[PDB]
Amino acid sequence: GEEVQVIIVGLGIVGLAAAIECREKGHSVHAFEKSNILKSIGDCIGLQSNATRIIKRWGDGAVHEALRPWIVSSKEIRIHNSSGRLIIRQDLSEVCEQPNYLLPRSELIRVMYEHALKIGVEISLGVEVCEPSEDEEGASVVALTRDGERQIVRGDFIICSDGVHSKMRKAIMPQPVEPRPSGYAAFRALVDTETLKGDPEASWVFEGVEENDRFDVFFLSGAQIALQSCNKGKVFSWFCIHQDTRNLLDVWTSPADPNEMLDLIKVWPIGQRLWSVIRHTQPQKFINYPLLNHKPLDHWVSSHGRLILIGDAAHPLSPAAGQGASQGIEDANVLATSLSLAGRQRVSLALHVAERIRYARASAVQLISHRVNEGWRNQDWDAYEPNEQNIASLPLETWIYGHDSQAYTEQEFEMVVRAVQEGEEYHATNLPDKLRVQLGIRNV
Numbered sequence: 001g002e003e004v005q006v007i008i009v010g011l012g013i014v015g016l017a018a019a020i021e022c023r024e025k026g027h028s029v030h031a032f033e034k035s036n037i038l039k040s041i042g043d044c045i046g047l048q049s050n051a052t053r054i055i056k057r058w059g060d061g062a063v064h065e066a067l068r069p070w071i072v073s074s075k076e077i078r079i080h081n082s083s084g085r086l087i088i089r090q091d092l093s094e095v096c097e098q099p100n101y102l103l104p105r106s107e108l109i110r111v112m113y114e115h116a117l118k119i120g121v122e123i124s125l126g127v128e129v130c131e132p133s134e135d136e137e138g139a140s141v142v143a144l145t146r147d148g149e150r151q152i153v154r155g156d157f158i159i160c161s162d163g164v165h166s167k168m169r170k171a172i173m174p175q176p177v178e179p180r181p182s183g184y185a186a187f188r189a190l191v192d193t194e195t196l197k198g199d200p201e202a203s204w205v206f207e208g209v210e211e212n213d214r215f216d217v218f219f220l221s222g223a224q225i226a227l228q229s230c231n232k233g234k235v236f237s238w239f240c241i242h243q244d245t246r247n248l249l250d251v252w253t254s255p256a257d258p259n260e261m262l263d264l265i266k267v268w269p270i271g272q273r274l275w276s277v278i279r280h281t282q283p284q285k286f287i288n289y290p291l292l293n294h295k296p297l298d299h300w301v302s303s304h305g306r307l308i309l310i311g312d313a314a315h316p317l318s319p320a321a322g323q324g325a326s327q328g329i330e331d332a333n334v335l336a337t338s339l340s341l342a343g344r345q346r347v348s349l350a351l352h353v354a355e356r357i358r359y360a361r362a363s364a365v366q367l368i369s370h371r372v373n374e375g376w377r378n379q380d381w382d383a384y385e386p387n388e389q390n391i392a393s394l395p396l397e398t399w400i401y402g403h404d405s406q407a408y409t410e411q412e413f414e415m416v417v418r419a420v421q422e423g424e425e426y427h428a429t430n431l432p433d434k435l436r437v438q439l440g441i442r443n444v
């Protein structure tokens, strides 16, 4: 009477959620990660209510208590024009009915990493996983260490949560499709809180932040800028979507030129005010990340049903929209629930059930987000003032953030099993009926 043996490749946000979900539900987990995931890198990650619904269950509420300093307290989004005038206050009252988090990525990683070690996930860092294989009875990978040693590692199935540049994707989709550039990029960073404090010209940014997180949006010709705070003003973060036709690589490590941001904003009346804050970004923390459009894959599960791509390995989203991490956490929760309902003798059924629950929903978020940064609702600001028309409603969509993916999986498991095994199409109701046919989403 043994436990299911789960191999996880990659401990970004989704791999760590997968590890915690699987272990909490009684399965044995060996996770593999090639780098030191604890180094501070990136800026802030947003988690909406569909993700925090899931996180709240971890450790009878332990991870939620650890994340409590990061609960979003913004009551509205304040939308401004290039003079800095406040045009519209968009109410966040229903979006914030249930908890949302905003926090540096590395602090999220740390909290999940420590919880995973506490509940008995086995973690191997400094391990590049490659050469996965599978049959009707099990799966294995090669664990390659930095000294060149190879170790074969066997388990019941492999979770590929190895990010947008996934090398495991080959094992499922042989020929790779290249994402299409949108012609837009995003400047983004954390601000150095210590030098931001002590600059009088930037003092305005702290007003109110101890009771209501800042969430200011600024629409300039050629730049859409958002400035947010969190944890009572201990962290400030900003981003700026601008036009960029350069051949930029989509990684989080390359140095950008801060003067490119400055030149873009200083020519409008509100530029000096915004720069008084943004100037306190550390020089080697300026990221300029291209917003690429990834087409949904044809499927996520391998031929023998023992490998599944889940997070950005399955459905990369640009940081522009705000559902990337949240959707990946739903992947881990639906998969772990599916594996629990199906049992150890029905692993391939478990993976195929989870893919059919998640595919159309995740593809719809992915396809809508294309129209957000490759197109968008950006008008001539010489003639129009910004308003809610110009705020990508994706994080404000109740059918995304109100969803309870574990409840759905439990209520629908047997109907999905029936479709898998009878070879019928499963029409999931965890997205709007009109949406699937409108976006051209074909069922797996």
Ligand SMILES: Cc1cc2nc3c(=O)[nH]c(=O)nc-3n(C[C@H](O)[C@H](O)[C@H](O)COP(=O)(O)OP(=O)(O)OC[C@H]3O[C@@H](n4cnc5c(N)ncnc54)[C@H](O)[C@@H]3O)c2cc1C
Pocket (backbone or CB within 6 Å): 009, 010, 011, 012, 013, 014, 015, 032, 033, 034, 035, 037, 041, 042, 043, 044, 045, 105, 127, 128, 129, 130, 161, 162, 163, 164, 166, 167, 252, 310, 311, 312, 313, 319, 324, 325, 328
């Ligand atoms: C360093 C870094 C910084 C980021 N910063 C931000 C940010 O500031 N804001 C934001 O919105 N998003 C950021 N992201 C992206 C964000 O993590 C994802 O968009 C999403 O939230 C979760 O995706 P994921 O967990 O599927 O993949 P990722 O977060 O990309 O995690 C993938 C992980 O897999 C590991 N890996 C890859 N190949 C292998 C292999 N063969 N063997 C073992 N391990 C492997 C990588 O080292 C990485 O740790 C960052 C990602 C990275 C990697």
Ligand SMILES: C[C@H]1CCN2C[C@]34Cc5c([nH]c6c7c(ccc56)OC(C)(C)C=C7)C(C)(C)[C@@H]3C[C@]12C(=O)N4
Pocket (backbone or CB within 6 Å): 046, 048, 072, 074, 092, 095, 096, 100, 215, 217, 224, 225, 226, 241, 319, 320, 321, 322, 390, 391, 392, 393, 394, 395, 396
């Ligand atoms: C391009 C930029 C210009 C301005 N931005 C606003 C946005 C809406 C939004 C975001 N995050 C949100 C959150 C939210 C409600 C709405 C949003 O609730 C909380 C709980 C506060 C957490 C995150 C962004 C990802 C930053 C997108 C992207 C963007 C936009 O159009 N719409």
